[PDB]
Amino acid sequence: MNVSIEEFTHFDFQLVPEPSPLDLVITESLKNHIEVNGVKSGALLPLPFQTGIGKTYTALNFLLQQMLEQVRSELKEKSKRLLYYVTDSVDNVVSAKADLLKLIEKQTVKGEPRFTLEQQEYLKAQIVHLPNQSEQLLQCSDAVLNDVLIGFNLNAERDVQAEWSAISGLRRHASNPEVKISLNRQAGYFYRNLIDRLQKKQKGADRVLLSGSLLASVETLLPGEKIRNGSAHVAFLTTSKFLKGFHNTRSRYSPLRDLSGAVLIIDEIDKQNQVILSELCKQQAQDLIWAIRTLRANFRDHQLESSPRYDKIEDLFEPLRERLEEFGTNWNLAFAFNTEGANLNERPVRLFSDRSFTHVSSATHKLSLKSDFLRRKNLIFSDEKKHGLLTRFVNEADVIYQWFLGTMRKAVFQYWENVRGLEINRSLEGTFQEAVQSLLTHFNLQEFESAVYESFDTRGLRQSAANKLSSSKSYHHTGLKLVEVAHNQGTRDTVNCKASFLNTSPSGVLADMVDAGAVILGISATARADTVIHNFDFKYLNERLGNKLLSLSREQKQRVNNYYHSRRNYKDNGVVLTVKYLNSRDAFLDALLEEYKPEARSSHFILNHYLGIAESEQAFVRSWLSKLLASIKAFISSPDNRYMLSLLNRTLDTTRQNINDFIQFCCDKWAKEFNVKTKTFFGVNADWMRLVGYDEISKHLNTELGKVVVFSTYASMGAGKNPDYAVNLALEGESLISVADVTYSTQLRSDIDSIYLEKPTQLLLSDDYSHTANQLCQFHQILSLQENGELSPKSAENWCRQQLMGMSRERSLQQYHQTSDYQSAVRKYIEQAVGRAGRTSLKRKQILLFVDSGLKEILAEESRDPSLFSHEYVALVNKAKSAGKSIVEDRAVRRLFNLAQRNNKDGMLSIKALVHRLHNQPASKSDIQEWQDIRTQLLRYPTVAFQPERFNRLYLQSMTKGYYRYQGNLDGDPNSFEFFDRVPYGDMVSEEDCSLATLVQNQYVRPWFERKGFACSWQKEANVMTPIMFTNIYKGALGEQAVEAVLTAFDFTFEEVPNSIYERFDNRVIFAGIEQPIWLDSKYWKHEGNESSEGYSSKIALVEEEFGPSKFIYVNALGDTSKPIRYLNSCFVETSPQLAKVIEIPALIDDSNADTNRTAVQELIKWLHHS
């Protein structure tokens, strides 16, 4: 029945249901965001309220109001606004879709249904659900497939009909449960093939016309075709499906490329952190040697067409072409690569790079790389003792590869700009595939076609342009890299460098999603958990998004708290939560095992033989099983409780059926002991929940009389399930009591009445996809813990080194158990799991909570504001705290110590790399500007009031307000630095040792400092410079500026130093029309210059060779004015003034009274006249 919008004309769009406080929480924040940041701006709104308060019901009412607003827009009149509902589990997707359909059906306004049957049918026609391809194929009938095959003329093909006949035959005898497996696999492969040929047919000139039955059948087979043609604009799907996209008749639609204006509702947003991570680690490794040799070979000559379509694109690739020419010249890319020597063949070389300051190599010795022109080979060898290291080559090749992928993204966007004007309503995603194909075909780089596509998929969300001390630096938009250097397959004389990259973290992906223009509603009670492993980094998201990260006011949070406490009034309704912490108590499991099999020798024999548990793992099974039994008995002993849920870490499916039999035996015994009927539901997982619905449990409690025990896990029943059941008053005595103060629900429902919470175990994420994926996931978690501040840079480097050498998973878990991130993840899991018993307002008078005693200390360490917790979590925390006493340790000061060490180490490594790039002549403009920007910034802002977002790595947060203490070798190990209170007799970073006030009392320095805008005082701001920037940059700029100011008053002219002699001397001096060039090397004060006459004489030799004879000035800005002015030759030997090429001045401004050394300047001027 074709439903139009003509039946919504008489609909009254201004009559809306009563807005709850949660509805005003979403609406007021979104209307303020629109009225402030603009209509086209994206936003991220986390909603971290109590479990079971009504956040998903409010998100589905918000989705229904968006659908009604869109219908009104089409009535008044454009393309459809896309609404997505995303969560990590399939069960929550289908439950939310059925809840929205129930909302449309059963919503009544003032005693009458809101929507007529035709309005309901249209609204339901606007919602789609996008499952995996096996579920999409298996859920549509044989008539639909035969209609599609006939309409598209595909039964003529032989392979297609053979595969479809096999599918229909296998699915006919689908009663057996092992046919269902290997039917999903073939359904997915057939769906791939059929959609590939359907799209190939639909893209050519022989494009079929779709209407009537063929259209309805292809919209049934391809739900994304409904979205493509504008029939639907609401989609329900999982996070992994959202990250992979779906299919329409034309191509595969990626929602991440078309997020401008979309609305995303991400339920349990924190658990999506790991899901996105699991996708980022699935990327394919690339051979960097082949990739760079191919890029260099195909960029020598190939040219784009001179067409208006390719306007402005050829200028994007010119810098990459010059870079490739110089890289291939420097590293001799005409030859291939092989290793040389011993110990390089037993195990391949593995290299790990943070890409900023963490570099770990598996080689014992630093590996070099030399070119043998006689052998025509590049040899990776180990030396016996510059620009010949393997790490340098690998880092530059990774930079060039990422530069190529970034310039491909820029050229695709420029192509879309040119073709929009040439084609004069085609989207950036519509033309993306044509742009990539045309560019790669023109450059003969079609082998990168896959690499470019996945590049758009992940960090392709990055419309970027960076790893400079002038940008905002973070691990989350930088990533990591793991390179394996091993021999090629088959060959025994060449090696490859297989590199795996993470170009962004999940928090980077979310931030780029908000920057794309999406409005994202993050719904979870743990949306602001203080972990970076099991949640996003919200300190990074706050710093990056700014005011696009919408916040809720104190009044709104008070209204929500009043809303929650007015519907969950436990204290006034006589409801008691009884918490019990259970130990192993093995003296009871031994008796239970004895009564299970009286004929056996002892319980060790029963466990080893009857239950099938090995001797090594018996003790663990002895501890977790007995705790479970101690909870079951206490539930059975309770006369009034009916519903129990036991959340474990492992599924009790048929694989552990022997243990299930033991558990079933024990339950039957207790059923006999108390004369209560009990039913146990084993193996309640995702597959069970899709095959056998959870309503069966709800059916049992509705009809049968007795108790029910459910055995599920955290991974299946811990985040968003509503496990309530319909209440039959005849099956419940005087036990249920309503705890809300004004009834708010139709139908009587009650929730879980007893719960057993095991301690979550495998809290450090893993990846079973491959070995590379698990390596990337482990290095991502170490770098996230170092970037947040939970790990010292020394401990993070030691953990990255043990990870590169192949540490065991138990050692990793032991290292992660030592952080506070682990405790915040444990409390997050406990709070979410305990929130499954708080869904309804019909409560039992007593609710039994049985908790693993291994959680007792952890729950005792909870110290957040208790104004946001649920009642059960407050009961758990109060019980744990009242049980004993714990020593509370501070977490912000350890983070400040770690982040001071981190910032100092990053500044050290970046400064050394930048100076090394400066010393390699010629020096590019970018490096010169970067050096000047650092010196300018540190001169203008030695301290900053707020946390910087441009030079963040130049500053650290200090305990004190304008100074701090430190200890460390500034030319040694950056991992051995100490700060603040750990060193009470260390050095200082302040104004007192600067002598800045002493320096600026000079009559000529002060006007220069005032004109330039340089600070003459250190503002007492908590963000102060790092010791590296204090000593190697700031004081050098202070001395150079003071010397230049003093000399410029004496008619001295200064020029920029040529790029080939940069960083060698401060400035170039021209005075009194002297044709002899003068070179200036200015220092702040005397200190200690370790450069002996060797390095200085080498510098003089280099400058004299470049520019002939010249004079030199070795001047110190500050010092004693009574000291003599000395004359030295190029060999630093004292001689007569007339035969000395270098004159050294001890000082230019006095330090004891701040008086300019006029005599020394006069003598220098006179000697210059003599020169």
Ligand X SMILES: Nc1ncnc2c1ncn2[C@@H]1O[C@H](COP(=O)(O)OP(=O)(O)OP(O)(O)=S)[C@@H](O)[C@H]1O
Partner DNA sequence: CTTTTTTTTT
Partner DNA sequence: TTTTTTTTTT
Q: Which is nearer to Mg ion, 267 or 862 (CB)?
A: 267
Residue 262 interacting entry, from Mg ion, DNA, a second copy, none, C-beta within 5 to 8 Å by type:
a second copy
- The verdict on whether residue 490 carries a ligand-binding annotation is no
Alpha helices in 458-585 (DSSP H): 506-516, 538-545, 554-565
* Cis peptide leading into residue 17 (ω within 30°): no
Identify the residue among 413, 605, 620, 744 touching ligand X (CB under 6 A). 744
In eight-state DSSP terms, residue 901 is H
Contact region for Mg ion (CB under 5 A) — 405-413, 714-722, 791-799, 816-824? 714-722
Handedness of CA 48, 51, 57, 58 (dihedral sign): negative
- The verdict on whether residue 854 carries a ligand-binding annotation is no
φ/ψ region of 597 (left if φ > 0, alpha if ψ in -120 to 50, else beta) reads beta
Contact region for ligand X (CB under 6 A) — 50-58, 62-70, 449-457, 753-761? 50-58
Identify the residue among 131, 460, 508, 720 touching Mg ion (CB under 5 A). 720
Contact predicate 1038/995, CB 8 Å: no
Q: Does 884 bind a second copy (CB under 8 A)?
A: no
- The verdict on whether residue 189 carries a ligand-binding annotation is no
Identify the residue among 686, 883, 959, 988 touching DNA (CB under 7 A). 686
Q: Which is nearer to ligand X, 136 or 832 (CB)?
A: 832
Q: Which of residues 709-728 bind ligand X (CB under 6 A)?
A: 720, 722
Residue 56 interacting entry, from DNA, a second copy, ligand X, none, C-beta within 5 to 8 Å by type:
ligand X
Site string for ligand X, 665-704 (x = CB under 6 A): ----------------------------------------
For 87, phi and psi rounded to 5 degrees?
Answer: -145, 170
- The verdict on whether residue 51 carries a ligand-binding annotation is yes
Identify the residue among 25, 405, 676, 765 touching DNA (CB under 7 A). 765
For tokens 């309770």, name the residue. 638
What gap in Å lies between CA 958 and CA 899, rounded to an integer? 10
Contact predicate 1011/1049, CB 8 Å: no
Nearest to 826 by CA among 850, 854, 847: 854
Q: Which of residues 725-784 bind a second copy (CB under 8 A)?
A: 768
Site string for a second copy, 517-536 (x = CB under 8 A): xxxxxxxxxxx---------
Contact region for a second copy (CB under 8 A) — 487-495, 569-577, 615-623, 1094-1102? 487-495
Q: What angle do CA 810, 815, 818 make, to 5 degrees?
A: 130
In eight-state DSSP terms, residue 707 is E
- The verdict on whether residue 1026 carries a ligand-binding annotation is no
Nearest to 785 by CA among 819, 827, 825: 819
Q: Which of residues 190-209 bind ligand X (CB under 6 A)?
A: none
Q: Does 718 bind Mg ion (CB under 5 A)?
A: no
- Min dist CB 590 to DNA, Å, is 19
Contact region for DNA (CB under 7 A) — 409-417, 682-690, 890-898, 1003-1011? 682-690
Q: Does 716 bind DNA (CB under 7 A)?
A: yes
- Min dist CB 523 to Mg ion, Å, is 5
Q: Which is nearer to DNA, 18 or 768 (CB)?
A: 768
Contact region for a second copy (CB under 8 A) — 20-28, 226-234, 292-300, 1155-1163? 292-300
- The verdict on whether residue 386 carries a ligand-binding annotation is no
What gap in Å lies between CA 1022 and CA 450, rounded to an integer? 48
Site string for DNA, 988-1027 (x = CB under 7 A): ----------------------------------------
- The verdict on whether residue 415 carries a ligand-binding annotation is no
Q: Does 52 bind ligand X (CB under 6 A)?
A: yes
Contact predicate 237/85, CB 8 Å: yes
Number of other residues whose CB lies within 10 A of the CB of residue 1088: 4
- Min dist CB 55 to DNA, Å, is 20
Q: Does 54 bind ligand X (CB under 6 A)?
A: yes
Q: Does 1167 bind DNA (CB under 7 A)?
A: no
Instruction: Locate 883 and state its tokens.
Output: 């049980």
Q: Which is nearer to a second copy, 371 or 853 (CB)?
A: 371
For tokens 């040792």, name the residue. 993
Residue 745 interacting entry, from ligand X, Mg ion, a second copy, none, C-beta within 5 to 8 Å by type:
ligand X
Q: Which three-class secondary structure string do you get for 265-311? A: EEECHHHHHHHHHHHHCCCCCEEHHHHHHHHHHCCCCCCCCCCHHHC
Contact region for a second copy (CB under 8 A) — 442-450, 585-593, 847-855, 1047-1055? 442-450
Nearest to 319 by CA among 307, 311, 327: 327
Identify the residue among 32, 108, 116, 307 touching a second copy (CB under 8 A). 307
Contact predicate 938/1030, CB 8 Å: no
- The verdict on whether residue 267 carries a ligand-binding annotation is yes
Q: Does 273 bind DNA (CB under 7 A)?
A: no
DSSP per-residue letters across 746-770: SS-EE---EEEEPPP---S----S-
Contact predicate 867/943, CB 8 Å: no
Identify the residue among 12, 18, 178, 315 touching a second copy (CB under 8 A). 178
- Min dist CB 717 to DNA, Å, is 8
Residue 1093 interacting entry, from DNA, Mg ion, ligand X, none, C-beta within 5 to 8 Å by type:
none
Q: Which is nearer to ligand X, 408 or 719 (CB)?
A: 719
Nearest to 229 by CA among 80, 380, 10: 80
Number of other residues whose CB lies within 10 A of the CB of residue 67: 20
Nearest to 637 by CA among 595, 573, 580, 701: 580
Name residues whose C-beta falls within 8 Å of residue 281's C-beta, 6 or more positions apart in sequence.
502, 767, 769, 772, 773, 774, 776, 777, 780
Contact predicate 682/652, CB 8 Å: yes
- The verdict on whether residue 57 carries a ligand-binding annotation is yes
DSSP per-residue letters across 473-495: --GGGT-EEEEEEEEPSS-SS-E
Instruction: Give the number of residues in contact with a second copy, rule: CB under 8 A.
Output: 163
Q: Does 182 bind a second copy (CB under 8 A)?
A: yes
Contact region for Mg ion (CB under 5 A) — 220-228, 260-268, 956-964, 973-981? 260-268
* Rg of the chain over all Cα atoms, to the nearest angstrom: 36
Q: Which is nearer to ligand X, 102 or 347 (CB)?
A: 102
**Strand partners for 581:** 851
Q: Does 504 bind a second copy (CB under 8 A)?
A: yes
Q: Does 806 bind DNA (CB under 7 A)?
A: no
DSSP per-residue letters across 245-265: -EE-SSSEE-GGGS-TT-EEE
Q: Does 651 bind DNA (CB under 7 A)?
A: yes
Contact region for DNA (CB under 7 A) — 51-59, 648-656, 1008-1016, 1098-1106? 648-656
Q: Which is nearer to a second copy, 14 or 176 (CB)?
A: 176
Determine the residue type at 273.
N
b/e map 1053-1071, b = 16+ CB within 10 Å: ebeebeeebbbbbbbbbeb
Q: Which is nearer to a second copy, 334 or 945 (CB)?
A: 334
* Site of interaction with DNA (CB under 7 A): 88-91, 131-135, 159, 185, 188-189, 191-192, 237-238, 240-241, 244, 246, 278, 617, 619-620, 649-651, 685-687, 713, 715-716, 761-763, 765-766, 768-769, 808, 810-811, 813-814, 817
* Site of interaction with ligand X (CB under 6 A): 51-57, 524-525, 720, 722, 744-745, 839
| Binding-site residues from annotation for ADP | 51-52, 54-57, 567
| Binding-site residues from annotation for Mg(2+) | 56, 267-268
* Site of interaction with Mg ion (CB under 5 A): 56, 267, 720
